[PDB]
Amino acid sequence: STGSATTTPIDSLDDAYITPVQIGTPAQTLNLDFDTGSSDLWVFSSETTASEVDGQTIYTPSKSTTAKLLSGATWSISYGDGSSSSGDVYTDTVSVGGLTVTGQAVESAKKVSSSFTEDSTIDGLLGLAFSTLNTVSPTQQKTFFDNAKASLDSPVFTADLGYHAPGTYNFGFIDTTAYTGSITYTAVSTKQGFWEWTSTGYAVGSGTFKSTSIDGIADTGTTLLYLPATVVSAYWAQVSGAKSSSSVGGYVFPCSATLPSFTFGVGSARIVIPGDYIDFGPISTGSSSCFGGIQSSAGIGINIFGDVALKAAFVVFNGATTPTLGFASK
């Protein structure tokens, strides 16, 4: 089997992407944030504290003839941005772009933190990291990809995120029309539960490439590119007036600037992020200070190849017995 679904930016900055997902019988369609940095499929629901729902579409398990309470199971998750959610668990039928999994764990939110409530466009998350990170207790549950894998034509999914435009998540096949050149594959460590890999270095604008190993994760659920302080300083030094602002929470730059590109290495291959992809707009409405799309990871503990980096590439998440990642230009 295969599936193919369009993913759409939630706003004019590409802060996140939503993909429609069918849950239950008859189908209830929710727009979920596909997140290769986590491993829980959770949704706003008829059980979510009413004051914490503000415009989201909810899953109502009592209206699904295929929903079953997973008795005794609870979940609770905290994300790198400080947001969180928790609740109980049902199993139900879940379809993405024509690909159907029966018996998928659908984690129903009883509580969500303020940032989720405040984002009316995201009805939940669909985790695509390794199932060892799933938070369901006392019986850990499998991701949608893990449950679908054996049925897929090939045990892969691909992320093709757009810049200020829709893109595609495919399951079970590699669309050879969606990229240019060849796909370069690179080793993955699953030891932390992430799609963790080592970039071979970087360049800033037209500058020379610096060969240096940068370990990080391919994370569709993180907006920006978070890299070591040395790398980030070298980038922003090329932008007149750019500075790190403790009050704003990162590097800012004059909105009048033209940003240089940023290149990262994948083996001997190179992915070029255009300068425009690094502009996240005014820090507050009407400001002439703009927020940068490359930020330091020094306070995280891990480097993160988020949407800023991934949307410059066609990315293969290869879930074979030994997983690997592939990157192509597009």
Swiss-Prot record:
Domain Peptidase A1, residue spans: 17-328
EC number annotated for this UniProt entry: 3.4.23.22
Origin: domain of life: Eukaryota
Top EC group: hydrolase
Record flagged with keyword Transmembrane: no
Keyword NAD: no
Record protein name field: Endothiapepsin
Originating species: Cryphonectria parasitica (Chestnut blight fungus)
Taxonomic lineage: Eukaryota, Fungi, Dikarya, Ascomycota, Pezizomycotina
Gene transcribed to yield this protein: EAPA
